[PDB]
Write a structure and sequence with these properties.
There is one protein chain. This protein has 89 residues and is an alpha+beta fold. It has one domain: 2-Layer Sandwich (Ribosomal Protein S8, Chain: A, domain 1), CATH 3.30.1370.10. Helix content is 43%, strand content 19%. The protein contains 4 helices and 4 strands. Strands 1-2-4-3 form a 4-stranded antiparallel beta sheet. A hairpin with an 8-residue loop joins strand 3 and strand 4. Helix 2 crosses helix 4 and helix 3 runs antiparallel to helix 4. The longest helix is centred in the C-terminal third of the chain and has 17 residues. The two termini are 18 Å apart. The relative contact order is 0.25. The PDB classes it as rna binding protein. Keywords: KH domain, RNA binding protein, ksrp. It forms a monomeric assembly.
Length: 89
């Protein structure tokens, strides 16, 4: 399982679960200043962005995205940025 998405139609608390397959080095970059960057954005947006070093099914890191439509947007926006510059797309 990867990316998640959301098989259920309820609010983005689960309909916007994004499991982001992100290279572990690009996680070093997603935190930017060493961690605080992602905290700023995930706390600012209101999105439940959790970095998973355990991953689950991926060898690299898996970032789980959940929250509200606009929070999950802001959150996944930063994820898109770094994961695009790392994995291409």
């Amino acid at each position: 399982i990867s990316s998640q998405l959301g098989p259920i139609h309820p609010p983005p608390r689960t309909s916007m679960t994004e499991e982001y397959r992100v290279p572990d080095g690009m996680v070093g970059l997603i935190i930017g200043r060493g961690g605080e960057q992602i905290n700023k954005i995930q706390q600012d947006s209101g999105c439940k962005v959790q970095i998973s070093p355990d991953s689950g099914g991926l060898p690299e890191r898996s970032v789980s995205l959940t929250g509200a439509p606009e929070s999950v947007q802001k959150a996944k926006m930063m994820l898109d940025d770094i994961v695009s510059r790392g994995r291409g797309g």
